[PDB]
A paper describes a structure:
The cryo-EM structures of the [name]–20S CP complex reveal the architecture of a co-axially aligned AAA-protease assembly featuring a substrate conduit from the entrance pores of the slightly tilted [name] tandem OB domains to the AAA motor and into the α-ring of the 20S CP. Interestingly, our structure reveals that the β-grasp domains of [name] contribute a second contact in the form of the β-hairpin loop between strands 16 and 17, which interacts with the N-terminal H0 helices that form the gate of the CP. In state A, [name] protomer 6 (cyan) depicts the β-hairpin conformation that is the farthest away from the gate pore in the outward position, while protomer 1 (blue) displays the most inward position right above the pore of the CP gate. These positions are slightly offset in state B. Interestingly, while in state A, all six of the canonical aromatic pore loops of the [name] domain are in close proximity to the substrate backbone with one of them (protomer 6, cyan) initially disengaged, in state B only five protomers are in close proximity to the substrate backbone and engaged in interactions with it. The loop of the penultimate protomer (protomer 6, cyan), which was at the bottom of the staircase in state A, is retracted away from the substrate in state B and has shifted upward by 25 Å to a more distal position relative to the proteasome gate. Furthermore, in state B, the five pore loops contacting the substrate are shifted downwards by 2–3 Å compared to state A, which results in a translocation of the substrate towards the open gate of the proteasome by almost one amino acid. In state B in comparison, all protomers of [name] are resolved with ATP bound, including protomer 6 (cyan) with its pore loop now in a disengaged and retracted conformation. Nevertheless, protomer 6 still exhibits less contacts to protomer 5, and the arginine finger that it contributes to protomer 5 does not contact the nucleotide, thereby creating a fissure in the [name] ring between these protomers.
Residue numbers in the entry:
A (entry chain d), B (entry chain 8), C (entry chain 6), D (entry chain f), E (entry chain 0): 8 to 190, 203 to 234
F (entry chain C): 489 to 587, 603 to 609
G (entry chain b): 301 to 523
Write the structure that this text describes.
Amino acid sequence: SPEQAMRERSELARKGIARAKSVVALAYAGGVLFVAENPSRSLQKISELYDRVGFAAAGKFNEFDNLRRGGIQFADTRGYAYDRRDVTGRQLANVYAQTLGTIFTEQAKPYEVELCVAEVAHYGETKRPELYRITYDGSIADEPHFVVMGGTTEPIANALKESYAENASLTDALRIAVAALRALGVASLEVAVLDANRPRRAFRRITGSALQALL
Amino acid sequence: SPEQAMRERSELARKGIARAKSVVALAYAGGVLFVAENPSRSLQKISELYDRVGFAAAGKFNEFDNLRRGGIQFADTRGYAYDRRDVTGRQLANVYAQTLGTIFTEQAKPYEVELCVAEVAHYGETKRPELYRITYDGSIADEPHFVVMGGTTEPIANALKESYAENASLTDALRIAVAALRALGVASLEVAVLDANRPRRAFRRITGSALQALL
Amino acid sequence: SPEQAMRERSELARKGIARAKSVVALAYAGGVLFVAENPSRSLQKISELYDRVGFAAAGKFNEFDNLRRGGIQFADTRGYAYDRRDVTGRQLANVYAQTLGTIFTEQAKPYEVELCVAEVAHYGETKRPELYRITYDGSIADEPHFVVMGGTTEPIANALKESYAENASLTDALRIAVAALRALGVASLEVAVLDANRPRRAFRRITGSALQALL
Amino acid sequence: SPEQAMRERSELARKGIARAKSVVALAYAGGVLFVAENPSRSLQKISELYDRVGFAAAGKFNEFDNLRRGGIQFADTRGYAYDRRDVTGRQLANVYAQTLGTIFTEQAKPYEVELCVAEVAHYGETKRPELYRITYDGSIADEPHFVVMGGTTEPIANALKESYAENASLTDALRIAVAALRALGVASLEVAVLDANRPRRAFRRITGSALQALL
Amino acid sequence: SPEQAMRERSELARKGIARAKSVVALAYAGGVLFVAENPSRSLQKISELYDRVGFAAAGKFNEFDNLRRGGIQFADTRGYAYDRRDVTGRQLANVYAQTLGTIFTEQAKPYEVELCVAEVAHYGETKRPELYRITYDGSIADEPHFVVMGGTTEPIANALKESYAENASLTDALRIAVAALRALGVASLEVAVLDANRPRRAFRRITGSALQALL
Amino acid sequence: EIDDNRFLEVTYANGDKEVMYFKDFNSGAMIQNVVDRAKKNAIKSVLETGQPGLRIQHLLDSIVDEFAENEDLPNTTNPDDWARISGKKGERIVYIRTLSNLGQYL
Amino acid sequence: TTIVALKYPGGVVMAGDRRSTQGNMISGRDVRKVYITDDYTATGIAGTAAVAVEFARLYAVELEHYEKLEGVPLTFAGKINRLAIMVRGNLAAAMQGLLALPLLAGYDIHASDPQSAGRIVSFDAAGGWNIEEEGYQAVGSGSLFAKSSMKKLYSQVTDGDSGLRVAVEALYDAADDDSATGGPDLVRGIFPTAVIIDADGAVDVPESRIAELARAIIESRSG
């Protein structure tokens, strides 16, 4: 029955996102910072999508890694068909929205996932970081400062609301993000950046001893 | 009972269009004016379809953008197969009239979309602007002066009924359209025109500081 | 079980045709005359099918325009495959009957439509105009004088029964047809003829000022 | 309920794994040791997957042998498409997880199987053995010391927890594994190793008189 | 209840095997001996599969003959694709197990069949005869001495348990097998051997007067 | 709006399932029970420390301690409250709760 | 065309000329034939211009694509294999005269000895490849003259700089004895292009350094 059939799927999807780890993405001076609570060393929740476009997700992994792979596929096919500077974070976000909507109204079970697509400017260029959040509905929201995904998002979102500062350095934004996430050592954190200063590939993981020094 | 299911499909589609922002399209001296209430900067509800044919929509984003894309596809395939001056707003309206009927009877859920196809005359030519409204039923209404889509259409339609003036300039038609739409700044408006004076491509967006001056 | 579905299919189809405009087609000295009550300027209910074969319809527009297109397709494929003078109104009527029967028994919803296929003799030839009416189920009836389709057919059919005169001129047949149809100006009438005197293509619309003079 | 159906599927899969023999895999000085309770001489529950990647399973023989075959297929196609040193235990584990996430939600009956993928370092190289356990749901667990699959896992796991010693020789780890498994002669044991000292193919069965001497 | 539904599918197959005749296969000095109670002269329940691999079955004739044919197909395709000495009784038994499991879970009705695959050593070679029994579900059992299939298996299995003697000659094993089967003349017995002494094709029927002399 | 006064969690199907606090259910009988519990706490205090008085802290603690003994509200309200919760939200209430081996969640 | 590559103690260097011809006619004076396909490889392609640029582009895309899917770059062996499979794929068009041969330089981070982690790999038209062990390779119409120059000059290679100098000289002699290879154009200021790969990745040599080296060679030859 119309909304009644759709809404029942939505309840299952919301429940799954709630039983998952929390991820945050925020803008800082050098670009965008992803900080996720991740115990495993093999399975990840933050990924490069294209030269300047990054991706974070929270919820059933077989599902958001399926989306990770699909997005990689899309971006590379476009970049090769047209050019690298034509693929934008906006297109990617839009494709994820269409795809999550189509899964919501057709597949048996809705993807219990929540996505965040991030983009920074090109090298030697000037432009503000763009964050998009795509939900399981197919809904897409434009975020100016930070995105919080998975688990209980209220306390983390509020702590970030008090601590956030534009043009914070890498270390300050890392402290703010870990602090608000607590509301964890290098053995339970997945940290990566979209460093706007890199010439081409902006995504860069911060692990091990370098991460140790930063936090 | 197909009748009970069809009756609930029609109600579901009507609720979806009502649960959305409002768009207006009206004729003025230089052609046709689209004024939509749109907060996002990436997601758009007004589009070029062909050289002299524009398009506005109200409802579910992913679906009327599906129709936007289909219409672009159609128009370009015709223009290349025959010629550019053979594609008319009338053909386009008819194709969206039949596609929305087929969707409304054959797909699980009817599309919750309301369409307006607009056409102006060619360059150095003389002819009145044509507005068509295509509903989720697939009905096509020929409008002489203005179309109002999405949300609560009564107060906007009446305000336009009192304020409308044929051969109003661009600024007057913009004031009338924004006023009747209120019944919003450059950061919450999507404004474009089908300027009949352009040589080939008539569609032209009015954004930023130019929009600021006009309103 | 199939017969109970057929009883539901009879009423639904009948009610839909009743929810439509009335069309008449009658024989006169120069051939056949179609007079339909049609407000729109783009949507038409009278059409050329082949050199000497015309077509009128009443019901859901998307469905009788689907039939219009199918019939055009058929007639041209035959005319090219064999020759132009081999396609006859009788073949066309028969195809429409087969197709409306198959639709009426096999598709989910029966085409709420009523068709009239008309044929006149070739140029310099002598033969009486033939009218066929095809109903939603596949039934086909041979009419000697006039066909009335859609809406309430009784009063129009009776008024024509009193006013009809064989070998009436174009103006008299137009007066009789408009009068019996009333039981409307050039802005609400779709008028065309199958003029038996034309060399090849007999169908010819009568619109605007010429229609104004005739009525 | 939807939740009840998923819980019922989980119970059926748990019952099948419980109705089966027990397998253990543990790290020792020379690599990884698989010790399974297996009466048959033809049917095996431990297998080579690739040069340095081994595989053990517990459940329904036809299904975990189906997975055995699929994994062999995968690993060889990758090794040939890229190179041998590119296939890692981590990829294999991930593929099995995706496959047991798709089978569980899409097929009629979930696979009642418990998988363990093991990897050691290459020849003359230094790195800790990695054990992964893939459950019938599609979850993957990273194990530092040992994996126990099938039957009554908790009593066997408790004994290994007391007896385990890193860098135990082959004979000591065999005694510990058989002891904890008892919580059986060469005619009821399937024993194999991932010997890190072998130049290329690390998997090596220990059967017959050599097994007799070791235990 | 899935377990109860499987019990119904298990009872139906068990009922079919009981509603039939009994077959025995036992090891003797020269190889393996098949003795079946078979009245027809055209329909057979014992068959050559490959050079040294024989096959007996009990249940529904069309189905175990379907399996007979499939097995022949398999064995020859392997023997040609690799070599004759590469096809073993163990592979064949395993294929029948996979196939009867797939049939038992996926087809409408389970195959009411019971299979026995037998293998002997090659010519001038030394090795013990191997007997495998495959049941309707896919289960496979390794038998050291004899297999009894179809009908009431308890009395025959016990009589064989008392009378069996390893390295019994052909005549003694025939007497033991017919005696335990009684718990019948040449006109109601199907007798064949897997004679290990033959150079290549080991299967050999014993019918007519030669059978008369042996019993 | 603080999560200290949590009463129920309504599993709205469309997500953003809402937390209903005590303010959503403060009936008159509930208020009388709260004031009686506060009075009992004041009696316990005067018997424990001797001073003859009523503390505001007694009422403040009774606010949070009223839910320790359910007032027959959770999971047992009339469909009128459920209807109002749904009408305000615009979504059907799948389930209500008071305040594993099923795939992998990251 | 001519592209040389040589190992030096600690790294690899790869340089290429700039001319592109049609028959006897000089059509391009500044083509770049050496690309940085990834942080530890560089690919020169001799032959048909279209097929060359496309090979380079698509190969870079594929390396980086697998890197994004798996979270780790292929081993140098896997990269060698993929390039070889592309080259084998162009074989029919190469018989139709669309031949393109790649020369692949890389720095293996996983090799045992850092001082000899440099890698040079050469391909034929049929996709077979070979790991060069005599320390240098070249491809193109001038390749024979370039190799015969480096055979004598190679004892002078002791670090990244001397290796670069030797590369530029080898190119100069290729161009000196073959007309399809362009030498340093002192008039327009167009010099060979060079890429250096070592423990820290791949960087393009800035033009000025190649300029100074070319002018040193030219002053040496004229006396």
